[PDB]
Design a protein around this ligand. Structure first.
Ligand SMILES: *[C@@H]1O[C@H](CO)[C@@H](O[C@@H]2O[C@H](CO)[C@@H](O)[C@H](O)[C@H]2NC(C)=O)[C@H](O)[C@H]1NC(C)=O
Ligand SMILES: C[C@@H](C(=O)O)c1cccc(Oc2ccccc2)c1
Ligand SMILES: CC(=O)N[C@@H]1[C@@H](O)[C@H](O)[C@@H](CO)O[C@H]1O
Ligand SMILES: *[C@@H]1O[C@H](CO)[C@@H](O)[C@H](O)[C@H]1NC(C)=O
Ligand SMILES: [Fe+3]
Ligand SMILES: [Zn+2]
Ligand SMILES: [Zn+2]
Length: 341
């Protein structure tokens, strides 16, 4: 009676989830929805139990009363004896990436350029960079700052969707799931790499995992790191090896959320599922790896080492930290105490 219904966002997640479901002997089964917001609503209703969320999505979910359960944890430096599940999480570095060739474009000349964003309301792709730009300009006209963008989840006929490409057929332009060619970390970095946009708002790790052979994927196999630079907030440009000193912010790790009344069942099952299909897991790479999806980042980021227990049974505000929570409150002025649903 601890069976968990995962929420898959879009059909490729759904496909991975079904393979997970089948491989788990139905300890995990799958609900599917078209956007993250719809998946949150399913969980609210009790029609799904859980999914992994970006930080901006944890905020929306948390005002609706959902709670973080386990955090994604990637490759670590200090405290590396301590086992992944126990090891605290550090956050990731939100960066703004450009082409080297595009000379002279800096954090200080982004007005009227072309922008690539993971999705609207995501941490590295939107909350951080738009939060900065509104604050930098005293202006809530964030939809008027770039000339065109791919910002999945924005109005498809607005300039915020003009660069979005939609699916293999050109359908679903600007939908916030992986059918949108330029959706997500890997999508927004693609948007930049094919020179559709002038800047992509992603995290530090995306640049590395999609260059210098780390990706075999079609558009990525020939990408070279030296061809990109990070935009720092002092107006300078740096190599993508300097993310530590040229980032826009540090982001709270993506975390599994659930209904509070289900949080404990979800926690146990996921710990158990990870021992079966995570990094060194009994059945990965043999039958199934929870943490791989050929760089599509389906249901978990592909760089995820393990899902880690959280210290202090945190609220969602505590999980996100009080800096990030205000920044998001401030930004949402352009648009306090209400669940959105
Ligand atoms: C930014 O991201 C890259 C890619 O994740 C980091 O480099 C990896 O880090 C671990 C140790 O932290 C190495 O052992 C991996 O092999 C690296 N991956 C690759 C593909 O080279 C880098 O450390 C991160 N930088 C900062 C400043 O956070
Ligand atoms: C308020 C709304 C708008 O466009 O006017 C908006 C702004 C930014 C992000 C959004 O995405 C969500 C999603 C769920 C709840 C609230 C906002 C929704
Ligand atoms: C068929 C199947 O998956 N059975 C599982 C098994 O892993 C375990 O005995 C238990 C504990 O979580 O859950 C159930
Ligand atoms: C924007 O301005 C407010 C007011 O100073 C500040 O609290 C917030 O952290 C700023 N947001 C970002 C994303 O830097
Ligand atoms: Fe994120
Ligand atoms: Zn910093
Ligand atoms: Zn607390």
């Amino acid at each position: 009676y601890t069976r968990v219904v995962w929420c898959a966002v879009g059909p490729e997640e759904q496909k991975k989830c079904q393979q997970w479901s089948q491989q788990s002997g139905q300890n995990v089964t799958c609900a599917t929805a078209s956007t993250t917001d719809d998946c949150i609503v399913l969980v609210l209703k009790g029609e799904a139990d859980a999914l992994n969320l970006d930080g901006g999505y944890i905020y929306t979910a948390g005002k609706c009363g959902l709670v973080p359960v386990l955090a994604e944890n990637r490759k670590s430096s200090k405290h590396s004896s301590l086992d992944c599940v126990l090891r605290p999480t550090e956050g990731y570095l939100a960066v703004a990436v450009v082409k080297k060739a595009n000379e002279g474009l800096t954090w200080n000349s982004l007005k009227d350029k072309k922008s690539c964003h993971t999705a609207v309301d995501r941490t590295a792709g939107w909350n951080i960079p738009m939060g900065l730009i509104v604050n930098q300009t005293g202006s809530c006209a964030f939809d008027e700052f770039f000339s065109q963008s791919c910002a999945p989840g924005a109005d498809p006929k607005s300039r915020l969707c003009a660069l979005c490409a939609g699916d293999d057929q050109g359908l679903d332009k600007c939908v916030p799931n992986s059918k949108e060619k330029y959706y997500g970390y890997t999508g927004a970095f693609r948007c930049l790499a094919e020179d559709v946009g002038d800047v992509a708002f992603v995290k530090n790790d995306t640049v590395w995992e999609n260059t210098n052979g780390e990706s075999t994927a079609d558009w990525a196999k020939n990408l070279k790191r030296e061809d990109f630079r990070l935009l720092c907030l002092d107006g300078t440009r740096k190599p993508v090896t300097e993310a530590q000193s040229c980032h826009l912010a540090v982001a709270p790790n993506h975390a599994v959320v659930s209904r509070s009344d289900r949080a404990a069942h979800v926690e146990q099952v996921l710990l158990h599922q990870q021992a079966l299909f995570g990094k060194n897991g009994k059945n990965c790479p043999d039958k199934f790896c929870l943490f791989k999806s050929e760089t599509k980042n389906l249901l978990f980021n592909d760089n995820t080492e393990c899902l880690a227990k959280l210290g202090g049974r945190p609220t969602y505000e505590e999980y996100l930290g009080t800096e990030y929570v205000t920044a998001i409150a401030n930004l949402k002025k352009c648009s306090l105490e209400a669940c959105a649903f």
